[PDB]
Design a protein around this nucleic acid. Structure first.
Ligand SMILES: *C(=O)c1cnc2ccccc2n1
Ligand SMILES: *C(=O)c1cnc2ccccc2n1
Ligand SMILES: *C(=O)c1cnc2ccccc2n1
Ligand SMILES: *C(=O)c1cnc2ccccc2n1
Lengths: 8, 8
DNA sequence: CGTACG
DNA sequence: CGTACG
C-alpha cells in the first residue's frame, strides 16, 4: 500500500 | 551534494 | 553517496 | 512492490 519506491 | 538516498 | 513502507 | 541526485 505505502508508496515511498513502488506504489502498490 | 543532493540528498534524496545518501547525503554527500 | 545510498533511503525510502504499508 | 521498488524510487530517489546534485
Ligand atoms: C501496502 O500496504 C503493501 C504492503 N505490503 C506489501 C507486500 C508486498 C507487496 C506489496 C505490498 N504493498
Ligand atoms: C522503493 O523502491 C523501495 C525499496 N525498498 C524499500 C525498503 C524499505 C522501505 C521502502 C522501500 N522502498
Ligand atoms: C553532490 O552534489 C554529489 C554529486 N556527485 C556525487 C558523485 C559521487 C559521490 C557523491 C556525489 N555527491
Ligand atoms: C539513495 O540511496 C539513492 C540511490 N540511488 C539513486 C539513484 C538516482 C537518484 C537518487 C538515488 N538515491
Amino acid at each position: 500500500x505505502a508508496x515511498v519506491x513502488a506504489x502498490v
